[PDB]
């Protein structure tokens, strides 16, 4: 099915039921962007994103980082250095409740 986002689907065809493309898994809630930091686990990726936090008393900001564990289907084989799109879903494992939906810029 063509899901409720606006991204191009992958040129592959998986058969795993845990995929939002070609499967029965369904995405709902938030969707963000990030970069891949690790791709060593089987069908697993770690994603980081940066943001600035304002400190009132001193009137200045500090940079903070957020790590998120996501599922990586076979039709979308994301590797380190990629800028990726992830979406919230039901819990898949102990640490994973997000899924990769599209790669936006491969690495070199």
């Amino acid at each position: 099915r063509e899901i409720g986002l606006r991204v191009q689907p992958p040129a592959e065809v998986c058969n795993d039921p845990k995929c939002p493309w070609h499967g029965n898994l369904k995405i709902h809630g938030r969707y963000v962007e990030g970069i891949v930091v690790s791709d060593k686990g089987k069908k697993t990726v770690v994603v980081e994103r940066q943001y600035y936090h304002y400190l009132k008393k001193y009137e200045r900001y500090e940079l903070r980082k957020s790590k998120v564990h996501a599922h990586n289907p076979e039709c979308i084989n994301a590797k380190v250095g990629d800028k990726v799109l992830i979406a919230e879903t039901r819990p898949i494992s102990k640490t994973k409740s997000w899924v990769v939906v599209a790669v936006l810029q491969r690495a070199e």
């Binding site: 986002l5 606006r6 709902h28 809630g29 979406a87």
Partner: protein, 242 residues
């Protein structure tokens, strides 16, 4: 640690849509489940005792209710916990009185007096649609009620139209659609109790609800959610509003 459901309500924890003194006593009447939500309704005891003033004590109010004197949507209601909500009619024949329940520009519920002829109609907004066994169509309305229609006339109903009905027998009249020149009355939000004509609808991705633009009766535009827009006419309201 609570081991089950609640059966009590404190006055300081009551909803803002009510007209109630909060620092006078400690307890309030906890509404029973029913047609409307808790944030958009109020029990009958308060309408009989604190709004209209036909009684000073809950014993008197309960006697009045159990004697079979108050009607809602054309039906006798004896439960003092029964919730009354938006677009409902409260009628008293021993005084020929008829009221429609509506919100203010603050979000509080008032009684607008109407006539005995308009007191026989109630508009219902369609909230959802289903197929039921036998291939019948079930419309799920805004007060929580349901209505059956046939498969042959399923395209004549959608999930934001309005249906006017004779309330005690519940027969359909004067379907009103959601279009770009329809008249609407807002029920919730910051622009509550305003009215106007539709101009534009906007859709969004991944769960975010749709939005609607409305033109005031004098030229001013505003926006709100499509679920908070209640169609009441095509170019002229079909009920007496304040």
């Amino acid at each position: 640690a609570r081991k089950g459901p609640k059966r009590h309500l404190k006055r300081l924890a009551a909803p803002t849509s009510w007209y109630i003194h909060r620092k006078a006593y400690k307890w309030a009447v906890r509404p029973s489940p029913g047609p409307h939500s808790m944030k958009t309704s109020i029990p009958l005891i308060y309408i009989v005792r604190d709004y209209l003033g036909y009684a000073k004590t809950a014993r008197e109010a309960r006697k009045i209710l159990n004697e079979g004197k108050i009607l809602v949507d054309g039906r006798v209601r004896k439960d003092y916990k029964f919730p009354v909500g938006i677009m409902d009619v409260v009628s008293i024949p021993e005084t020929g009185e008829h009221y429609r329940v509506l919100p203010n520009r603050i979000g509080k519920l008032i009684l607008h007096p109407i006539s005995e002829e308009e007191a026989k109609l109630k508009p219902f907004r369609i909230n959802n649609k289903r197929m039921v066994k036998g291939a019948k169509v079930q419309l799920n309305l805004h007060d929580g009620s349901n209505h059956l229609v046939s498969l042959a006339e399923k395209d004549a109903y959608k999930t934001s139209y309005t249906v006017i009905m004779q309330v005690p027998e519940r027969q359909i009249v004067k379907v009103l659609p959601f279009e770009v020149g329809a008249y609407v009355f807002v029920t919730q939000g910051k622009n509550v109790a305003r009215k106007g004509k539709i101009v534009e609808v906007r859709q969004f991705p991944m769960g975010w609800p749709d939005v609607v633009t409305i033109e005031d009766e004098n030229g001013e535009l505003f926006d709100t959610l499509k679920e908070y827009a209640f169609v009441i006419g095509k170019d002229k309201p079909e009920i007496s509003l304040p």
